[PDB]
Write a protein that binds this DNA or RNA. Structure first.
Length: 577
DNA sequence: GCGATCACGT
DNA sequence: CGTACGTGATCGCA
C-alpha cells in the first residue's frame, strides 16, 4: 500500500528516495507532469503535481544535491521541471542508464522492461497503462497513482542489484562518472534549444517549391504522363515498363529505384537526372524545410531536440524531434539549410569543433598497428597514405581515383570489413574488393591482427567492450547462418571503434562543461553530432574558445596517437565551416 | 496505424 | 545479403 498524500510532509523529504516525476507526453519539452511518487525508508507516497510543485519544501528537496534520488530517465523529468523553473539535483542512480549500460540490446525503455532483467515483475509496462498511439491517455488517479508508486518501488528495489552487476562489469564508474553527468549536460543542451531563422527557412521553402514545380513538369513532359513521382510503385512502371529502362536490381515487390541504380540509368534517358533532382529538392522540402518548421516553438523560434541517451547499440547519442544530427552538409544546395541555425542572442556566434578521423585514430590505438599509428603521428592525410600503401606508389602518384578508393576501404575497415559491401560501394566485383582488403592487411598487419583477435574474443567472452568499458553482447557470433554470423563479426569489429569514439566525445563534453564553468564563460553547448560539438557564445569569447575547446577535446583521453580537433566559427551554423 | 524504400548525417 | 550506427517522410495495404 501507499499514501495518497494531500500535502507534502517531512517524511517525504528523506535524504534517499526513489523518485518518479511522470511526464507522459513523448516530447517532454514544456510538457505536463501528471503525477509524482516517492519511496523512501518511511513509506510510499503519491503526490499530485500541482500540490508538490507549489510546496517550497518539496521544491527545495528536489533541488538539494545532498538529498539523493533514484530514478528512471531522470533527464525527462529534469527537463520537464526546467520548463517550470524548478531545478532537479541529487540524482545518484538512473535505472534507465544502468540498464542501457548492462545490455543495450534489451531495448529497455521503461521501468518494467528493466525490472524484468532482475526477475521483478510487480510493475506494469507504461504502454499497458497509458495505451498506444491514438488511444494514448492518462488514466484516473487511482490507476495512475498505483502505477507511479509501483515504478518507484521497483527503482527502490532494483538499485542494489543493478549497481552490483555494473560493478562486476567494471561499469560502475561509467555510469556514475560518465553517463549520469552527461544526462545533466544533455538536459541543459535540449532545454537551451537552438535558434531557427524561420523567415529564411520559409523563403528557402518557397524557392524549393518553385524549383520542384519546374522539375516535376519536366518529368511529366519526359514521361509523357502524369504520375506520383514520390511513389516507387508508379516510378517503377514509368521507368522499367513504359520507358523500358534496364532493370539493374529488383526489390522484393517490384523494381529498385535507389539513387544507386538511377545514376547508372542516367545515360539511357533524360528523365533519370530529373528524378534525381526532384528527389534531392523534395528531401530538403519535406524533411528539412517543412519538417523543421513543424517543430519550431513559435514563441521563441527555437527547436528543442531530445537526445536519446539509452538507445544506440554502440553508445552514440541519437537526436529526435527534430533530428539535429542529419542536417545536410555534403551537397551545397542542402547545406544552405544550416544558414537558418543562428545564435540565440545578438552578437553571439556559432562555434563548432570536430575530431579529425577519431575512428581511425581509435583503431590505430586499439590495434597498435605501427604503420597506422605512425601515419597519425606524422599527421598524414590518412586516405592518401592508405592509397600509397595499398597501391604501392609515392604521394605524387596518387590519383584522385586511387585516393577515393582508399577512402572507401578506410570507411569499410571501420565497418565490418567484408568485401561485398565494399564491392557494392566501389561498384566493383567481389573478386577485386577482396584483393583491396588483402593489400590493406599487408600494409596494416596490426589492424588485421586486431580484427581476427576481436572476433575471437567476442566468441570467447560473448561481448566486446569499448575503451571506457561499454559492452555489446554478440550472441550471433556463433550462428551457423553465414549472414547472421557475418553481421555479428562486423559488429565485433566496429563496435569497439565506434563506441570508443562515442566514449571519448562524451567525456570531452563533461570536461568542456566543467571548464566553461571554471572559466566563467557564457558559451553554451548546443549540439553533439557524434564527433563534433557545436556551441554558441558571445563574440568576445571566440578567441578564448579557440584555445579552450580544442584542448579539452584533444585531452579527454590519452591515446597512443594524438587526438586532433578542427574548429570554426561564424554567424550561422553554415558559416562555422 | 505499420513495414518497406529511400535519403539524410557520422 | 551484409558495408557500421541513427531518424524521418512517403506510400500503400488492411
Amino acid at each position: 500500500a501507499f499514501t495518497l498524500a494531500d500535502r507534502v510532509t517531512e517524511e517525504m523529504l528523506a535524504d534517499k528516495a526513489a523518485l518518479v516525476v511522470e511526464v507522459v507526453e513523448e516530447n517532454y519539452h514544456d510538457a505536463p507532469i501528471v503525477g509524482i511518487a516517492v519511496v523512501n525508508e518511511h513509506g510510499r507516497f503519491f503526490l499530485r503535481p500541482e500540490t508538490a510543485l507549489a510546496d517550497p519544501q518539496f521544491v527545495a528537496w528536489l533541488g538539494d544535491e545532498t538529498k539523493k534520488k533514484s530514478m528512471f530517465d531522470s533527464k525527462r523529468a529534469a527537463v520537464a521541471l526546467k520548463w517550470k523553473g524548478i531545478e532537479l539535483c541529487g540524482v545518484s542512480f538512473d535505472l534507465l542508464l544502468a540498464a542501457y549500460l548492462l545490455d543495450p540490446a534489451q531495448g529497455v525503455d521503461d521501468v518494467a522492461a528493466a525490472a524484468k532483467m532482475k526477475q521483478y515483475e510487480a510493475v506494469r509496462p507504461d504502454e499497458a497503462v497509458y495505451g498506444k498511439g491514438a488511444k494514448r491517455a492518462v488514466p484516473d488517479e487511482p490507476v495512475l497513482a498505483e502505477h507511479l508508486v509501483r515504478k518507484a518501488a521497483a527503482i527502490w528495489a532494483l538499485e542494489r542489484p543493478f549497481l552490483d552487476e555494473l560493478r562486476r562489469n567494471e561499469q560502475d564508474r561509467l555510469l556514475v562518472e560518465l553517463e549520469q553527468p552527461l544526462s545533466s549536460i544533455l538536459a541543459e543542451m535540449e532545454f537551451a534549444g537552438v535558434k531557427v531563422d524561420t523567415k529564411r527557412l520559409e523563403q528557402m521553402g518557397e524557392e524549393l517549391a518553385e524549383q520542384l514545380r519546374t522539375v516535376e513538369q519536366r518529368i511529366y513532359e519526359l514521361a509523357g504522363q502524369e504520375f506520383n513521382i514520390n511513389s516507387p510503385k508508379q516510378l517503377g512502371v514509368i521507368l522499367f515498363e513504359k520507358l523500358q529502362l534496364p532493370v539493374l536490381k529488383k526489390t522484393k515487390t517490384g523494381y529498385s529505384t535507389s539513387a544507386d541504380v538511377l545514376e547508372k540509368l542516367a545515360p539511357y534517358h533524360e528523365i533519370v537526372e530529373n528524378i534525381l533532382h526532384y528527389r534531392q529538392l523534395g528531401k530538403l522540402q519535406s524533411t528539412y524545410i517543412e519538417g523543421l518548421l513543424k517543430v519550431v516553438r513559435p514563441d521563441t523560434k527555437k527547436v528543442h531536440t531530445i537526445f536519446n541517451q539509452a538507445l544506440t547499440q554502440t553508445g552514440r547519442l541519437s537526436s529526435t524531434e527534430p533530428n539535429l544530427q542529419n542536417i545536410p552538409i555534403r551537397l551545397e544546395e542542402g547545406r544552405k539549410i544550416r544558414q537558418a541555425f543562428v545564435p540565440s542572442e545578438s552578437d553571439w556566434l556559432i562555434f563548432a569543433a570536430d575530431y579529425s578521423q577519431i575512428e581511425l585514430r581509435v583503431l590505430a590505438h586499439i590495434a597498435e598497428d605501427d604503420n597506422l599509428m605512425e601515419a597519425f603521428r606524422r599527421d598524414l592525410d590518412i586516405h592518401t597514405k592508405t592509397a600509397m600503401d595499398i597501391f604501392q606508389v609515392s604521394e605524387d602518384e596518387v590519383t584522385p581515383n586511387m585516393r577515393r578508393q582508399a577512402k572507401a576501404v578506410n570507411f569499410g575497415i571501420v565497418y565490418g570489413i567484408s568485401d561485398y559491401g565494399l564491392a557494392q560501394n566501389l561498384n566493383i566485383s567481389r573478386k577485386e574488393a577482396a584483393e583491396f582488403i588483402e593489400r590493406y592487411f599487408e600494409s596494416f598487419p596490426g589492424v588485421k591482427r586486431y580484427m581476427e583477435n576481436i572476433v575471437q574474443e567476442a566468441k570467447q567472452k560473448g561481448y566486446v567492450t569499448t575503451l571506457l568499458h561499454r559492452r555489446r553482447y554478440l550472441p550471433d557470433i556463433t550462428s551457423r547462418n553465414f549472414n547472421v554470423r557475418s553481421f555479428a563479426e562486423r559488429m565485433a569489429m566496429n563496435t569497439p571503434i565506434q563506441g570508443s569514439a562515442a566514449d571519448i566525445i562524451k567525456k570531452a563534453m563533461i570536461d568542456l562543461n566543467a571548464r566553461l564553468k571554471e572559466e566563467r564563460l557564457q558559451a553554451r553547448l548546443l549540439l553533439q553530432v557524434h564527433d563534433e560539438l557545436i556551441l554558441e557564445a558571445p563574440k568576445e569569447e571566440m578567441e578564448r574558445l579557440c584555445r579552450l575547446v580544442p584542448e579539452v577535446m584533444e585531452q579527454a583521453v590519452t591515446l597512443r596517437v594524438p587526438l586532433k580537433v578542427d574548429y570554426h566559427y561564424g554567424s550561422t551554423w553554415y558559416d562555422a565551416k
